[PDB]
Amino acid sequence: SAEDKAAVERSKMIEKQLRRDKRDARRELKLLLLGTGESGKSTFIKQMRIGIIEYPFDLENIIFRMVDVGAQRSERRKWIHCFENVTSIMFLVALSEYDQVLVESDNENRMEESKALFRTIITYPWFQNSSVILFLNKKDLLEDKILYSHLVDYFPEFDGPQRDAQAAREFILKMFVDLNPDSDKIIYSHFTCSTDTENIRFVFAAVKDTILQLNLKEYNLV
Amino acid sequence: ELDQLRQEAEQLKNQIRDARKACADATLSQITNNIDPVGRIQMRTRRTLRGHLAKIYAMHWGTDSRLLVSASQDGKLIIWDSYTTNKVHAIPLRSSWVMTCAYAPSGNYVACGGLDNICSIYNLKTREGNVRVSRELAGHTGYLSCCRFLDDNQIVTSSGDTTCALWDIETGQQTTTFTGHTGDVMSLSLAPDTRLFVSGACDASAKLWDVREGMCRQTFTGHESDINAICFFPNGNAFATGSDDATCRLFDLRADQELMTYSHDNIICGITSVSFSKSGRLLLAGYDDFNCNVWDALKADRAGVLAGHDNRVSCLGVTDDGMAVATGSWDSFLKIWN
Amino acid sequence: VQLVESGGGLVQPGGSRKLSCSASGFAFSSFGMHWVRQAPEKGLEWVAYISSGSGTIYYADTVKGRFTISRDDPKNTLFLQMTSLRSEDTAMYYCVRSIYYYGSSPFDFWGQGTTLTVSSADIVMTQATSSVPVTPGESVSISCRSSKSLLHSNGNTYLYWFLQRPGQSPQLLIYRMSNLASGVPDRFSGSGSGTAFTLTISRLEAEDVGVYYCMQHLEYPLTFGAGTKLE
Amino acid sequence: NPSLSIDLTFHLLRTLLELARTQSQRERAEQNRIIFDSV
Amino acid sequence: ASIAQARKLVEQLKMEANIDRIKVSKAAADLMAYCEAHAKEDPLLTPVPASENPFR
Amino acid sequence: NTTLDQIGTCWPRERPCPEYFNGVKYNTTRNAYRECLTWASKINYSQCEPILQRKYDLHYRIALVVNYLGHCVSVAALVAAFLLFLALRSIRCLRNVIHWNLITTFILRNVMWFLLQLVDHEVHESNEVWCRCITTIFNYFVVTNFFWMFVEGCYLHTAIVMTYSTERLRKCLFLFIGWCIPFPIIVAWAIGKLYYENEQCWFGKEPLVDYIYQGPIILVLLINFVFLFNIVRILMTKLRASTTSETIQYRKAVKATLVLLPLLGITYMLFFVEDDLSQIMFIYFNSFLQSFQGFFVSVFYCFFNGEVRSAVRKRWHRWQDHHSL
């Protein structure tokens, strides 16, 4: 009928808009940012600029969409599965939290909770098709705190000078990298701070390398 | 005081268990031996709806059995014409991370929401002709897991902040809260008379809530793992639930205990969606096995399988007259079976 | 939600005019648009349709080859280029918006109108009675006939009813004889078979004075009834 | 006479046709020898 | 807060314990009777011919 | 009396041998003689000797058998892969569309190869319509396959060099490139061949028309070689970043190069263009590479493809669960 044909034409118009949005979705790349409030993630976002929170930003021609879910008070196990299509998972953690403890005020470090979250997220089967990015924040505050408070109280496996901030960075990095049981995946690590404006190029390079590794695996070249 | 309250609670739970055993003269399977089975199920695909760009998460049939609403990751809340596979609406979302959706029984409104913690209600019947935001019901700290309409004025939602809520649509504020669960609440199913509903949560126990009174009527601690989806039985005295432990559990409200366990040796995957047929004789359940199983709800036998999807099954529904079965998966296709 | 029309006036035969229709307050680009004409001594006569996105265009048999319908979505303006104007083309012109889908309410807004003065197989809609004197509070039964059956295999019968009040643009009353238009009170109803139609009015109000139209939407071109006035 | 790897199919076809023509001409020559010896 | 929560749980168990419960086999027979009575109204259990099915 | 002989020559009461008899050429330098008793019935044909530089026939028959076995098993694998691509409706991405069109072109040129086997010397000599049509269609599928390997080279190079441009590309461009472009090229080839060299069936060669179609193909191979270089360069960078061991780097780069070789057509550049032993090993090796190219591409990019294997497994589980109940 005339109404049936007009409805089909309107459906085709909708399909045209869906194709346009498909092209835009292809251009858009999703990025997941994980971390807690005390890590200083608002300063990181402020550097990157120049419920679930969307942070779109542009490159020269590449569009990135950073996703912040850290405001939500929930159990990750029953919603995190929707992030399978994210190219890389970013973990923003501060290096100065070794003197800090959880809200329960017991003998558990916030870095231990960070490691537990690190391994819990990596062991999810939906995220075993993507890469991991590790942002280590407050390196200058780490440099000040390691002189204020010696690197002895939470670190029984540390071998090095107790005031060597570079050894602290390398040791914490090593402990984080050793938590990944799957040799197929690589962790892209960066040392950042409140004044580091190069974080966007680290993200660009890490995402590019993630895409290239996914292509090389898909091409059966490795 | 805490230890004596815990001892009293344990004694009350033991009294409830003793009453449940006292009234358990028989199970369902011991009286269905004298009724004929449903036999072979030969349902086929009638329509395929191809209009989604990313993972589909939820759908809801309309009461006229003709229109359906579906939600997907790409930010389009798409309303489909079931007979001619026409696209009726493609509503852009402010937040594409949508987990649930609902269709009002009048056809005037739809609801949606997800990780934004906001229940968004859209008006389908406007002077301007376009679909715009009518209400933003922001009142939760966890993800919005399920919404269902009672009418155009009241909507029942359940979210991930352990609270269920009855929302007043016209005011924009909550009518009442249901602070009974200890874990994230995943789904709700409404009774046909709008007086009661059943919610389930990560604490492996279903709760019957009274919409108007504001109290929980029944607690069913019968599960081993997280409850994912609920569908209410049409006669108002029973319901069925699904969970990660691969057993689909048929509960009876008046019996105040379980009627029947559904399990099979070659099923190890959890349940993501459930629905009833019109008569309640056939129970439909979606699994991580990439198919939808047809179970004979009275004989307990396996009746059939509908396997027309490639990725994980996320949503399942049946028309109010039972005319058609609709399935949706993360492969961005919808399927209609009959 | 406004439609402001221009491009009319008094012209000479053989000339040409460009009509404009300025749309405001609604999502114009998603709508299909109609031009409708009405002679002073006649009822409404449908002229042309353009779909949303200009995917398809339809013309009446007496319109095709002479008039051109066009639209500009980013400025939300409808255009009509009319050449070879005849004395028979003197009429009040209407800019109409519509959406076509299951459950939609097309023709729910009619424009202000503009005056233009110039110095076979189609379905015929018959309304034999020119007017009925009425009294407020009484019921009214107004019949309409179609030359063809309007019952399609999908079960729907594509009849619409309209009210044109004196000095006012036509207002939609009923579509598909079951679904009452928004803003219209529940005292209006319709019924009938595939060919024999009835409009039933209970508890008549003073504001119900005007001309009643029945219309078929089975196939293009669209045709209108003669019109029944309530006096 | 250059031979390219992208025309090997037709090069082999031409060579096999030349060989078949050579064998056919040899057989016909022997038959003509028989005919002439008879005549 | 845990004391108040224990109080709420105790009162909820009191409210849920003091209810009238029906014989299980009787309710099961009522569900069976419901399934039987509406069997002819169920187009998934009962096949629908092409002249009635809008999908055929 | 004087009469004509079997050829039509009038004898006296000494003549040259005929030029041709049943298609065989003769050396007409020598004369035949007529015996006399009045003429005798015997004609002296002892002077009319028929006249008949060769290559090794056995090695060409071996190459033909090798081509038969390679193309037959390639046909089997391509049919299997084609059916797998049609049965598994989850395989939709642009990469797999390009690979499916590559499979289609391999099976079409193999079918044409089979169709062109029943040709004798008479079909060669007589420029019949069906022969030149088969030749033109075969050359069309060959240049079409080369253009689809150009498409694969461009897509692969983009995917490894330009991550933005990987997503910028659409199937609406590659379907155009892989179908519309070879048609006027093969039409211009057919027109030039009909105009210039129409004495023999068009698969023949004379000591310029073929450069119309052979010209860009070599250029395609050359640019794909350049593409391959950049890919290996990036691969080496990845090998520097991933494994940090020269043994693993070289093992992975060699395996990647060896598997990329039949996909991009670079095998034809490995052995490019007097010495009979070197020429026969040239023909043997290029016959091997050509006959197994479709087999190797189909097997590696379908039977060893993770996504394809998973889709096959899921389909098998669906079948087993459906039919078991």
Side-chain angles (χ1 to χ4, degrees), chain A residues 36-37 39-45 47-56:
Chain A
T36 62
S39 296
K41 67 181 179 67
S42 66
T43 306
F44 181 74
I45 296 304
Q47 294 295 321
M48 288 298 289
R49 184 177 178 179
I50 297 169
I52 192 166
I53 308 298
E54 298 295 327
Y55 289 146

PDB file of all heavy atoms in Angstrom, chain A residues 36-56, unseen atoms left out:
ATOM      1  N   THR A  36      40.838   4.919  40.944  1.00  0.00           N
ATOM      2  CA  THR A  36      40.089   5.477  42.059  1.00  0.00           C
ATOM      3  C   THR A  36      40.267   6.989  42.145  1.00  0.00           C
ATOM      4  O   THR A  36      41.088   7.589  41.446  1.00  0.00           O
ATOM      5  CB  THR A  36      40.518   4.817  43.375  1.00  0.00           C
ATOM      6  OG1 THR A  36      41.907   5.079  43.611  1.00  0.00           O
ATOM      7  CG2 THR A  36      40.297   3.312  43.310  1.00  0.00           C
ATOM      8  N   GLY A  37      39.438   7.601  43.001  1.00  0.00           N
ATOM      9  CA  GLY A  37      39.445   9.050  43.153  1.00  0.00           C
ATOM     10  C   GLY A  37      40.749   9.601  43.698  1.00  0.00           C
ATOM     11  O   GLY A  37      41.220  10.654  43.261  1.00  0.00           O
ATOM     12  N   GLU A  38      41.347   8.903  44.668  1.00  0.00           N
ATOM     13  CA  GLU A  38      42.587   9.353  45.294  1.00  0.00           C
ATOM     14  C   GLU A  38      43.809   9.247  44.386  1.00  0.00           C
ATOM     15  O   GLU A  38      44.876   9.740  44.765  1.00  0.00           O
ATOM     16  CB  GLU A  38      42.838   8.560  46.577  1.00  0.00           C
ATOM     17  N   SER A  39      43.690   8.624  43.211  1.00  0.00           N
ATOM     18  CA  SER A  39      44.799   8.572  42.266  1.00  0.00           C
ATOM     19  C   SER A  39      45.056   9.898  41.557  1.00  0.00           C
ATOM     20  O   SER A  39      46.080  10.020  40.876  1.00  0.00           O
ATOM     21  CB  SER A  39      44.546   7.477  41.227  1.00  0.00           C
ATOM     22  OG  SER A  39      44.514   6.197  41.834  1.00  0.00           O
ATOM     23  N   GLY A  40      44.170  10.882  41.690  1.00  0.00           N
ATOM     24  CA  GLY A  40      44.351  12.135  40.984  1.00  0.00           C
ATOM     25  C   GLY A  40      43.905  12.091  39.542  1.00  0.00           C
ATOM     26  O   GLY A  40      44.508  12.758  38.695  1.00  0.00           O
ATOM     27  N   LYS A  41      42.873  11.298  39.238  1.00  0.00           N
ATOM     28  CA  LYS A  41      42.415  11.115  37.863  1.00  0.00           C
ATOM     29  C   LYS A  41      41.825  12.385  37.254  1.00  0.00           C
ATOM     30  O   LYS A  41      41.855  12.539  36.029  1.00  0.00           O
ATOM     31  CB  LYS A  41      41.401   9.969  37.795  1.00  0.00           C
ATOM     32  CG  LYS A  41      40.082  10.229  38.508  1.00  0.00           C
ATOM     33  CD  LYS A  41      39.151   9.034  38.398  1.00  0.00           C
ATOM     34  CE  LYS A  41      37.845   9.284  39.134  1.00  0.00           C
ATOM     35  NZ  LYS A  41      37.044  10.359  38.488  1.00  0.00           N
ATOM     36  N   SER A  42      41.305  13.307  38.075  1.00  0.00           N
ATOM     37  CA  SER A  42      40.800  14.573  37.545  1.00  0.00           C
ATOM     38  C   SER A  42      41.913  15.438  36.965  1.00  0.00           C
ATOM     39  O   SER A  42      41.708  16.107  35.944  1.00  0.00           O
ATOM     40  CB  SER A  42      40.054  15.338  38.638  1.00  0.00           C
ATOM     41  OG  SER A  42      40.935  15.737  39.674  1.00  0.00           O
ATOM     42  N   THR A  43      43.109  15.382  37.552  1.00  0.00           N
ATOM     43  CA  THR A  43      44.231  16.135  37.005  1.00  0.00           C
ATOM     44  C   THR A  43      44.724  15.492  35.713  1.00  0.00           C
ATOM     45  O   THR A  43      45.107  16.195  34.769  1.00  0.00           O
ATOM     46  CB  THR A  43      45.352  16.219  38.045  1.00  0.00           C
ATOM     47  OG1 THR A  43      44.829  16.759  39.265  1.00  0.00           O
ATOM     48  CG2 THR A  43      46.478  17.126  37.568  1.00  0.00           C
ATOM     49  N   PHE A  44      44.719  14.154  35.664  1.00  0.00           N
ATOM     50  CA  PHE A  44      45.016  13.422  34.433  1.00  0.00           C
ATOM     51  C   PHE A  44      44.065  13.807  33.303  1.00  0.00           C
ATOM     52  O   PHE A  44      44.499  14.033  32.168  1.00  0.00           O
ATOM     53  CB  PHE A  44      44.958  11.917  34.693  1.00  0.00           C
ATOM     54  CG  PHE A  44      45.274  11.084  33.484  1.00  0.00           C
ATOM     55  CD1 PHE A  44      46.580  10.972  33.029  1.00  0.00           C
ATOM     56  CD2 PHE A  44      44.269  10.410  32.804  1.00  0.00           C
ATOM     57  CE1 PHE A  44      46.879  10.207  31.914  1.00  0.00           C
ATOM     58  CE2 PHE A  44      44.560   9.643  31.689  1.00  0.00           C
ATOM     59  CZ  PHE A  44      45.867   9.541  31.245  1.00  0.00           C
ATOM     60  N   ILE A  45      42.758  13.865  33.593  1.00  0.00           N
ATOM     61  CA  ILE A  45      41.772  14.260  32.583  1.00  0.00           C
ATOM     62  C   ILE A  45      41.988  15.707  32.146  1.00  0.00           C
ATOM     63  O   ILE A  45      41.866  16.032  30.955  1.00  0.00           O
ATOM     64  CB  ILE A  45      40.342  14.001  33.104  1.00  0.00           C
ATOM     65  CG1 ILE A  45      40.135  12.500  33.316  1.00  0.00           C
ATOM     66  CG2 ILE A  45      39.272  14.546  32.161  1.00  0.00           C
ATOM     67  CD1 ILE A  45      40.398  11.662  32.082  1.00  0.00           C
ATOM     68  N   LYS A  46      42.281  16.601  33.106  1.00  0.00           N
ATOM     69  CA  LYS A  46      42.618  17.990  32.785  1.00  0.00           C
ATOM     70  C   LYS A  46      43.819  18.084  31.846  1.00  0.00           C
ATOM     71  O   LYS A  46      43.837  18.918  30.932  1.00  0.00           O
ATOM     72  CB  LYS A  46      42.883  18.774  34.071  1.00  0.00           C
ATOM     73  N   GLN A  47      44.838  17.246  32.064  1.00  0.00           N
ATOM     74  CA  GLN A  47      45.977  17.202  31.147  1.00  0.00           C
ATOM     75  C   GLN A  47      45.589  16.621  29.789  1.00  0.00           C
ATOM     76  O   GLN A  47      46.111  17.051  28.753  1.00  0.00           O
ATOM     77  CB  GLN A  47      47.122  16.397  31.761  1.00  0.00           C
ATOM     78  CG  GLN A  47      47.744  17.026  32.997  1.00  0.00           C
ATOM     79  CD  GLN A  47      48.445  18.336  32.694  1.00  0.00           C
ATOM     80  OE1 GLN A  47      49.090  18.483  31.657  1.00  0.00           O
ATOM     81  NE2 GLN A  47      48.321  19.295  33.604  1.00  0.00           N
ATOM     82  N   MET A  48      44.681  15.640  29.775  1.00  0.00           N
ATOM     83  CA  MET A  48      44.278  15.009  28.518  1.00  0.00           C
ATOM     84  C   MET A  48      43.402  15.921  27.668  1.00  0.00           C
ATOM     85  O   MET A  48      43.323  15.728  26.449  1.00  0.00           O
ATOM     86  CB  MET A  48      43.551  13.689  28.785  1.00  0.00           C
ATOM     87  CG  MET A  48      44.445  12.559  29.275  1.00  0.00           C
ATOM     88  SD  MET A  48      45.714  12.084  28.087  1.00  0.00           S
ATOM     89  CE  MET A  48      44.714  11.293  26.829  1.00  0.00           C
ATOM     90  N   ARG A  49      42.701  16.872  28.298  1.00  0.00           N
ATOM     91  CA  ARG A  49      41.823  17.784  27.564  1.00  0.00           C
ATOM     92  C   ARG A  49      42.607  18.655  26.586  1.00  0.00           C
ATOM     93  O   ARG A  49      42.149  18.910  25.464  1.00  0.00           O
ATOM     94  CB  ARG A  49      41.033  18.653  28.543  1.00  0.00           C
ATOM     95  CG  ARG A  49      40.009  19.567  27.883  1.00  0.00           C
ATOM     96  CD  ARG A  49      39.204  20.348  28.909  1.00  0.00           C
ATOM     97  NE  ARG A  49      38.250  21.255  28.274  1.00  0.00           N
ATOM     98  CZ  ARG A  49      37.411  22.044  28.937  1.00  0.00           C
ATOM     99  NH1 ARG A  49      37.402  22.042  30.263  1.00  0.00           N
ATOM    100  NH2 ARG A  49      36.579  22.837  28.274  1.00  0.00           N
ATOM    101  N   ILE A  50      43.793  19.103  26.982  1.00  0.00           N
ATOM    102  CA  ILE A  50      44.594  19.982  26.140  1.00  0.00           C
ATOM    103  C   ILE A  50      45.917  19.310  25.791  1.00  0.00           C
ATOM    104  O   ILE A  50      46.199  19.046  24.623  1.00  0.00           O
ATOM    105  CB  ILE A  50      44.838  21.340  26.821  1.00  0.00           C
ATOM    106  CG1 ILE A  50      43.515  22.080  27.031  1.00  0.00           C
ATOM    107  CG2 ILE A  50      45.799  22.185  25.996  1.00  0.00           C
ATOM    108  CD1 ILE A  50      43.633  23.299  27.918  1.00  0.00           C
ATOM    109  N   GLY A  51      27.264   8.773  37.518  1.00  0.00           N
ATOM    110  CA  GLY A  51      27.084   7.854  36.410  1.00  0.00           C
ATOM    111  C   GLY A  51      28.309   7.716  35.528  1.00  0.00           C
ATOM    112  O   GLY A  51      29.382   8.215  35.871  1.00  0.00           O
ATOM    113  N   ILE A  52      28.147   7.010  34.407  1.00  0.00           N
ATOM    114  CA  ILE A  52      29.232   6.853  33.446  1.00  0.00           C
ATOM    115  C   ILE A  52      29.528   8.202  32.801  1.00  0.00           C
ATOM    116  O   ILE A  52      28.618   9.001  32.530  1.00  0.00           O
ATOM    117  CB  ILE A  52      28.897   5.755  32.415  1.00  0.00           C
ATOM    118  CG1 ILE A  52      30.126   5.370  31.597  1.00  0.00           C
ATOM    119  CG2 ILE A  52      27.739   6.128  31.480  1.00  0.00           C
ATOM    120  CD1 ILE A  52      29.924   4.095  30.830  1.00  0.00           C
ATOM    121  N   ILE A  53      30.811   8.520  32.660  1.00  0.00           N
ATOM    122  CA  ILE A  53      31.222   9.823  32.154  1.00  0.00           C
ATOM    123  C   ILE A  53      31.944   9.621  30.830  1.00  0.00           C
ATOM    124  O   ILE A  53      32.844   8.778  30.724  1.00  0.00           O
ATOM    125  CB  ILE A  53      32.111  10.568  33.165  1.00  0.00           C
ATOM    126  CG1 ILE A  53      31.431  10.615  34.534  1.00  0.00           C
ATOM    127  CG2 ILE A  53      32.337  11.989  32.708  1.00  0.00           C
ATOM    128  CD1 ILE A  53      30.110  11.363  34.537  1.00  0.00           C
ATOM    129  N   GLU A  54      31.538  10.389  29.822  1.00  0.00           N
ATOM    130  CA  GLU A  54      32.143  10.365  28.500  1.00  0.00           C
ATOM    131  C   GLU A  54      33.134  11.512  28.364  1.00  0.00           C
ATOM    132  O   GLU A  54      32.836  12.648  28.744  1.00  0.00           O
ATOM    133  CB  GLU A  54      31.072  10.459  27.411  1.00  0.00           C
ATOM    134  CG  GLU A  54      30.080   9.301  27.421  1.00  0.00           C
ATOM    135  CD  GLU A  54      30.724   7.964  27.096  1.00  0.00           C
ATOM    136  OE1 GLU A  54      31.676   7.934  26.292  1.00  0.00           O
ATOM    137  OE2 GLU A  54      30.283   6.938  27.655  1.00  0.00           O
ATOM    138  N   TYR A  55      34.303  11.219  27.793  1.00  0.00           N
ATOM    139  CA  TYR A  55      35.357  12.204  27.555  1.00  0.00           C
ATOM    140  C   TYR A  55      35.827  12.095  26.110  1.00  0.00           C
ATOM    141  O   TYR A  55      36.819  11.409  25.829  1.00  0.00           O
ATOM    142  CB  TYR A  55      36.546  11.957  28.486  1.00  0.00           C
ATOM    143  CG  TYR A  55      36.333  12.285  29.945  1.00  0.00           C
ATOM    144  CD1 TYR A  55      36.945  11.522  30.935  1.00  0.00           C
ATOM    145  CD2 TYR A  55      35.483  13.309  30.338  1.00  0.00           C
ATOM    146  CE1 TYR A  55      36.749  11.795  32.275  1.00  0.00           C
ATOM    147  CE2 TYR A  55      35.296  13.604  31.678  1.00  0.00           C
ATOM    148  CZ  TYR A  55      35.922  12.835  32.640  1.00  0.00           C
ATOM    149  OH  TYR A  55      35.724  13.103  33.974  1.00  0.00           O
ATOM    150  N   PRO A  56      35.082  12.649  25.156  1.00  0.00           N
ATOM    151  CA  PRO A  56      35.581  12.646  23.780  1.00  0.00           C
ATOM    152  C   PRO A  56      36.695  13.669  23.622  1.00  0.00           C
ATOM    153  O   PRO A  56      36.701  14.715  24.278  1.00  0.00           O
ATOM    154  CB  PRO A  56      34.350  13.026  22.951  1.00  0.00           C
ATOM    155  CG  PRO A  56      33.529  13.849  23.880  1.00  0.00           C
ATOM    156  CD  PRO A  56      33.749  13.275  25.254  1.00  0.00           C
TER     157      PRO A  56
END
